[PDB]
Design a protein around this nucleic acid. Structure first.
Lengths: 63, 180, 94, 61, 166, 182
RNA sequence: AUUUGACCUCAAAUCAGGUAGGACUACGCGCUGAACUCAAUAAGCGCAGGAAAAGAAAAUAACCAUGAUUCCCUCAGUAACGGUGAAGCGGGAAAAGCUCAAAUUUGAAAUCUGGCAACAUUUCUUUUGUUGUCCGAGUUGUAAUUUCAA
RNA sequence: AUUGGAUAUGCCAUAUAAAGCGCUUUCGAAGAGUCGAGUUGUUUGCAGCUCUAAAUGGGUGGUCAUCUAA
């Protein structure tokens, strides 16, 4: 099943490369230690290690 | 945009008919409920007495009538107001007591005067509350004999002192706390 | 003194002790809700900025810790309210 | 008329009847709440109206 | 009662458990439709304290709206227009991401007998409550138009009242 | 291509087994073993609540007895319902707790393993809410609790509690502090 | 192997029963909004009713304290802002209070829509219900008790 | 010909119950991307966005007084 999903997503990207291009969406002391301090938020823990491409694509383009 | 008042006599007549219709509908009981005696909340009007919205739970309990049946017999209840002085307490208490003394309750189901009712109820008549309970004003002091210690007492000399004490209250308030 | 001016200005009457109003109570900590707050605390953990405060406090840089806590929350009273709570958690963890 | 009375006899005492036989006062009245379900009250309110109903009183002048 | 635990957990939105669940759920609603039926509410404690009962007549719809006017008010208006036979009772935030905020809207079927015979919700069947979400009579609607009690919260000026005797 | 509903059906599963799962959720997909689960349900089959027909038969029987000539035994059954079970844990009246492993909103059961451990109540995570539903004559039961049984069943009730201890607490006892998934 | 039965999700039906649209718009509630303070106006868009909205204080006050909302006189053309422009108090018109979530009925889902059969009742053969039986909803919480005035 | 509410009168109901009041030797659950802060926009109020609470706590007014939001 997992291989089938990977193949389906790869085919989806292949067709989208030509047929569904049409994206174009517009139609008319404080230091590095502190930088680490605000570097931890609700999005910093959303670890993306080893995530599948069919999820990473929408996660990057949306989240 | 202009607001004209050509319906002022018409509004006055309509209100009178509405009062008349209200009286006809609920004739057994007075058309106005009992209201407590209440003092306005400002230095300009604290010398007067007017009609408050309703009585409080403490006044209701002191009078001996429960907050549940009080609405039924026609005693409005205010859950926000509180009594900060007994003078207002027994004042509103005696208003309720005279109300209850002059009050007659028709027995329900017309079978017997179960506990709190009236045996003879043929003397029913619609009368306004103001006649039985005429709200009064603050008692105007009558003539009193000359007081000797008051005579020696100057007057505004004191108001000057407690004023100066009030204005510089923080001044000595600092003085004690900083030296202690 | 029954006087119009002064620190006890106004009329003098017999003062009555008011009965307790239940809406004055809100903000009290019931034992049952305190227990439930303990359970969710141990089952949920702490927010990312809390973890940074743990690191800051365990490093004993309290000035920066309170400064960033105030920056995160917005008010000094909330920042202090946090600090005492997470230090209180600190000795419990220790 | 004879057909419609015949149809009303056929559908007498039934939950659903043809829309022609049903009443037509207004669309709003048809969609409104019926008096039975406007008079529906919780048991809490039933107890309140059982024990503390609007009493019948009067004042002696 | 477990709703106390559900409520106290909902307070901590930066917790590891809440963050993982929110991301997975928000991802799931993404390939779900913009507006879709939710057979059971995702926050039963929030739904119950907002007025939702698990009886025939109450409807839960999930809506996603992009960020960047009040999103909660817009969500209510869109769901109300999409389900035209339903009265919008209330709504509540469930999830968010970088660009999409997710809301669940509680609706009531005024035509259902389980609603028409319930005295605790019968008020919504009256015609005065048609499209409350559009007239601004919901919780977020009232808050958005500034209806409140206090000094903090027009026609009396633009008119010059001329009495009979003057 | 498969419909979008079944695509999302498979995609949700793969992600749930793919992402880094916090321990509070990771403790759920580790459940009770087979034979213990069968013995659990064998015991609960005896103490399933009476059906609606049985309740009605009892009610009419006692009603006619009172009407004609005239109080029953102590009921023995499993306790269901999330709030009722949580109350029993609070009052320590429950002896065994069973939690379905696949509750749709997981926050409804995420706090239970911590709560039973705080009260020292033997708890276990069993497979599927449907099986609990058939036990209590329902479609769905998010949690079951055994608080009282008959005297002859006390002996094997202690035995299964020991068995679930061995296979759920003596075994594992680390997934609640292990970063699951991934 | 694989057959059998559950639960979850999602479909399809000229399935059974319902509901939404459109029109009027003087008054009512919102969104939006110019130009010559103009004006939160006109225009545009959405949505109701016989009234609408608001409404039982996360309210005023600094008093011997007031006590839901709405409207009128007054405050007052005052405070305030840079010509705009209140509100508290006071006097009246009218008055009415309440309902949920948050706690176990656990010796018993006591709750509810629908199907079927009778019994009825009607502004009415056109309306609205009652009981019995079945299925379903529902323990991811329907009933009763509680809403801080407690 | 309708009704609206009461009065007199008849018949059913089922109270083995429910409710009000004084005491506590008791506990008293109370609404979260919500309050709040920074920033931009509209005429304090509202909205967008960064961030994000507490449980005698929170809001409002000058330690006190008054309210108990989401």
């Amino acid at each position: 099943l997992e291989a089938d999903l990977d193949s389906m997503y790869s085919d989806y990207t292949k067709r989208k490369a030509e047929s569904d291009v049409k994206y174009r969406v517009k139609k008319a002391r404080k230091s590095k230690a502190d930088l680490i301090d605000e570097g931890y938020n609700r999005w910093s823990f959303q670890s993306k290690e080893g995530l599948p491409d069919w999820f990473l694509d929408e996660e990057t383009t949306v989240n | 945009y202009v607001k004209t008042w050509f319906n002022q006599p018409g509004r006055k007549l309509r209100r009178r008919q509405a009062r008349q219709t209200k009286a006809a509908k609920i004739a057994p009981r007075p058309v106005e409920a009992i209201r407590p005696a209440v003092k306005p909340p400002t230095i300009r009007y604290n010398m007067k007495v007017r009609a408050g919205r309703g009585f409080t739970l403490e006044e209701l309990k002191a009078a001996g009538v429960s907050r549940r049946v009080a609405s039924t017999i026609g005693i409005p209840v205010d859950h926000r107001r509180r009594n900060r002085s007994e003078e207002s307490l027994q004042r509103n208490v005696e208003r309720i007591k005279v109300y209850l003394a002059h009050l007659i309750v028709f027995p329900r189901k017309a079978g017997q005067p179960k506990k709190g009712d009236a045996t003879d109820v043929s003397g029913a008549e619609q009368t306004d509350v103001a006649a039985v309970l005429p709200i009064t004003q603050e008692a105007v002091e009558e003539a009193k004999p000359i007081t000797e210690e008051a005579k020696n007492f100057n007057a505004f000399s004191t108001l000057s002192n407690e004023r100066a004490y009030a204005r510089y209250a923080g001044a000595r308030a600092a003085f004690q706390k900083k030296r202690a | 003194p029954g006087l119009v001016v002064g620190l006890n200005k106004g009329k003098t009457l017999t003062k009555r002790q008011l009965p307790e109003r239940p809406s004055r109570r809100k903000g009290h900590l019931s034992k049952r809700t305190a227990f439930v707050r303990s359970i969710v605390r141990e089952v949920a953990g702490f927010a990312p900025y809390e973890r940074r405060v743990m690191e800051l406090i365990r490093n004993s840089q309290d000035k920066r810790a309170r400064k960033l806590a105030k920056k995160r929350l917005g008010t000094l009273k909330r920042a202090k309210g946090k600090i005492e709570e997470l230090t209180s958690v600190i000795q419990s963890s220790r | 008329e004879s057909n419609r009375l015949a149809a009303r006899e056929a559908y007498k005492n039934k939950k659903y009847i043809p829309l022609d036989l049903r009443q037509k006062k207004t669309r709003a009245i048809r969609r409104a709440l019926t008096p039975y379900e406007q008079s529906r009250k919780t048991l809490k309110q039933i107890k309140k109206e059982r024990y503390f109903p609007l009493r019948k009183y009067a004042l002696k002048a | 009662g477990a709703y106390k635990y559900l409520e106290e957990l909902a307070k901590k939105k930066q917790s590891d458990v809440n963050l993982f669940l929110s991301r997975v759920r928000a991802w799931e609603y993404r390939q779900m439709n913009v507006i879709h039926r939710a057979s059971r509410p995702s926050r039963p404690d929030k739904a119950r304290r907002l007025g939702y009962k698990a009886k025939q007549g109450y409807v839960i719809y999930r809506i996603r709206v992009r960020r960047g006017r009040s999103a909660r008010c817009t969500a209510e208006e869109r769901v109300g227009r999409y389900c035209s036979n339903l009265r919008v009772l209330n709504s509540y935030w469930v999830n968010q991401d970088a660009t999409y905020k997710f809301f669940e809207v509680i609706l009531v079927d005024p035509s259902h007998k389980a609603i028409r015979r319930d005295p605790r919700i019968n008020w919504i069947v009256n015609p005065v409550h048609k499209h409350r979400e559009s007239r601004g009579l919901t919780s977020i609607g009232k808050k958005s138009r500034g209806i409140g009690k206090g000094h903090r919260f027009w026609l009396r000026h633009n008119t010059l009242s001329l009495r009979r005797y003057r | 291509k498969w419909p979008e509903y079944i695509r999302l059906q498979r995609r949700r599963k793969i992600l749930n087994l793919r992402l880094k799962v916090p321990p509070a959720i990771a403790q759920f997909q580790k459940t009770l073993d087979k034979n213990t689960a069968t013995q659990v349900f064998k015991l609960l089959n005896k103490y399933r609540p009476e059906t609606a027909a049985e309740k009605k038969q009892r009610l009419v029987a006692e009603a006619e007895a009172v009407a004609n000539g005239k109080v029953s035994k102590k009921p023995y059954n499993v306790k269901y319902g999330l709030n009722h079970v949580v109350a029993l844990i609070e009052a320590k009246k429950a002896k065994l707790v069973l939690i379905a492993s696949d509750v749709d909103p997981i926050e409804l059961v995420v706090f239970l393993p911590a709560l039973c451990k705080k009260m020292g109540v033997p708890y276990a995570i069993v497979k599927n809410k449907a099986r609990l539903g058939t036990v209590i004559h329902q479609k769905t039961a998010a949690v079951l609790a055994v608080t009282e049984v008959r005297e002859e069943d006390k002996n094997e009730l202690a035995s299964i509690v020991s068995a679930v201890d061995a296979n759920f607490s003596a075994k594992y006892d680390e997934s609640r502090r292990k970063w699951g998934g991934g």
